[model samples]
Target chain A: EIVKTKRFAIKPMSEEEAVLEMELLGHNFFVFQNGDSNEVNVVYKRKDGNYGLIEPELE
Target chain B: EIVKTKRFAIKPMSEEEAVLEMELLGHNFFVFQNGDSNEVNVVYKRKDGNYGLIEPE
Candidate 1:
């Protein structure tokens, strides 16, 4: 079955700000457009309370 | 282990359009910032030929 999708316009933000937002929301991860790279990236809260990022590759 | 990261520029695109890119890349999913919502979202290919999207809440 197809899942419901939410729409979000990726606002420009720095990595640090992304992290802050992620923590504030308390979500597992936060997705945003890297202002420097202008690419889609995911910042995830790890099991260790650290964070990780997932960057997409066009190729 | 810390995985080395790669940077990509998330281009502005519609959801239907994003699916096209994911199929072309052959990736399980494609992450993009929705043009309307301006929030982070992803389009992913399923086990079948279907596609799914993951949006940040």
Candidate 2:
């Protein structure tokens, strides 16, 4: 089955800001471009109420 | 600031299975280890109502 397509300008933000926004929205995760790394990353809320960050590397 | 640490056994599944699980949970995204690749991957719900996959290298 074909899946739907999706994109927009990814906002650049710091890791802290990303975590804060995720917490405010009560979202499990937030994807954004890191201002410092200029790469996309994700901040996720853990089951323990902590946070985890994912820094994806491109090929 | 030091962020809290987290970890657990990541379920190994196919991309299709990952997407299915994410949809079932109404989750915007699901992270899992791809069985074939033996690497971590994520399937995310796009704003357009489609699906997107991120395979971290």
Candidate 3:
């Protein structure tokens, strides 16, 4: 039997009304950064092709 | 005082009179292969500046 691989979101972030914010506090070191403003949504794909989200925090 | 690093050759090969040959056998899985004959010498440099040779077997 093939066991399902367990995965965890290392960090989570958010975006609201074009303003960017971080949601998960204290777990900030693992955030991925981008220099472009228009590229609001950033999606990361793991080596195994699993999708993870990064969204802005609520003000 | 800085200690001297010791490095061992994992595998060694040789080419003589244009015929390529493997000098050391059994230690085989780690060898790197290239198709060109003229590029005779295969030298590998560790993370440090030391060089180790892997000749044909």
- The candidate scoring highest on DockQ is 1
Q: CA lDDT, every prediction?
A: 0.66, 0.67, 0.27
Minimal lDDT window, size 10, model 1 chain B: B1-10
C-alpha positional error of residue A20 in candidate 3 after TM-score superposition, expressed in Å: 41
Q: What is candidate 1's lDDT per residue for B1-57, written digit by digit as tens?
A: 223254342677788878887777765556676787786577766668677777756
**Per-residue lDDT of candidate 1, residues A1-59 (tens digit):** 44646534358787778888877876555667778678667776656756667766532
Tens digit of per-residue lDDT, candidate 3, span B1-57? 111121122233332311223224322111222334422233333345443443322
Better of 2 and 3 by lDDT: 2
Chain A TM-score, each candidate:
0.74, 0.73, 0.24
Sort by lDDT, top down from the best = 2, 1, 3
State the number of backbone clashes in model 3: 10
Candidate 3's TM-score = 0.15
Stretches of candidate 1 above 4 Å error? A5-52, A55-59, B4-9
Show the lowest summed lDDT stretch of 10 residues, model 3 chain A.
A1-10
TM-score of each: 0.50, 0.51, 0.15
DockQ-based ranking: 1, 2, 3
Evaluate model 3 with DockQ and give the value: 0.01
Predicted complexes: DockQ each: 0.25, 0.18, 0.01
